[PDB]
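Narrative progress, year one. The postdoctoral researcher (J.K.) led the effort to move from monomer predictions toward full complexes, under supervision of the PI. The following entry was the first complex the group processed end to end, covering 380 residues in total.
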Amino acid sequence: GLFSQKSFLVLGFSNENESNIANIIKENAGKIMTVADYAVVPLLGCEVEATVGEVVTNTWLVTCIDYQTLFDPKSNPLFTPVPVMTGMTPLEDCVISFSQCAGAEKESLTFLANLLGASVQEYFVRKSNAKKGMFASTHLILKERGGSKYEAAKKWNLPAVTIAWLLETARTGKRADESHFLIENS
Amino acid sequence: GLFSQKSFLVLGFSNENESNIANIIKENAGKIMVADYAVVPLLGCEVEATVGEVVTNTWLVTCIDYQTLFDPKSNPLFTPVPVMTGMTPLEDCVISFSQCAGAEKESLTFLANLLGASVQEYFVRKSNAKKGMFASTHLILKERGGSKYEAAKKWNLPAVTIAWLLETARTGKRADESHFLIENST
Amino acid sequence: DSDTDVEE
């Protein structure tokens, strides 16, 4: 099993939600609780008074399972609790598209972006289209230099930023300088 | 240079093709003519003269694209690839690739076509005549991960390893996809 | 994969 020889605490979720999560861990050879290897917590985190090896997110758990790989939680900031300056919405007029992101990582970035007041769009378009129901885009968030959307942003002169821009925005409560997080400089 | 103090021998290419390769080798500091390497077509040709090791232009072009000198044994397209000629085992297949780029991808697409498959950029669930997309039958990739892989799982379509392609190629017989699922790769 | 390239 993927989670074989690993023990888990499932903290921070509703009764129904943690029952599901626990079952998924069990279905992947993990044990539910001495010291547990992992405390699974929601993306934004929660109180963990118990002592555990490391605190990790449901985004870690699910990604790990989706790719049948035990990713080192430190390999992605979404794998451990993400600090968000509560109740702040510094991205209230942004229309964000993601490129190069898939699945649970993408569902989590989406949640964050909405949480900061952004609106997240599947299609990266330069101009609003009411009949089509799409809004002009203002940001593109991506992992690497390349691909259709990246070229479009370059052409349209829209900022193309690494994920760190989004997370720095969340931590501070303030819209990070897009120019410090351009994909061209990574 | 990268091919600093490396002697080469180009074999099996066309009148012009020989020259383009010879050029790109000098252009990265190698010498032409016992040679350190013998560059031959993807399918390999007649090598009488004794050389260090027989590599392919796919290896060559790949090396230059990364500015790294790769071990020829570290990828099966870097050395001549066995193909049972005359066979079109992939006759009815429509193949997408994922996680493959540049020279490697040109070569794999080469072999796929050779076996009589058609190759598409887009992984496509349903044929769309207006869009020009035929429904895909196979995904060929490297790891579990990414949107192409997720569509394959969701669509119940085989997402297989590169070795599926090369084994079909070797025997002229369609490899059993179930023996090459990326889902089971370790 | 610089492009998603997924359809339907």
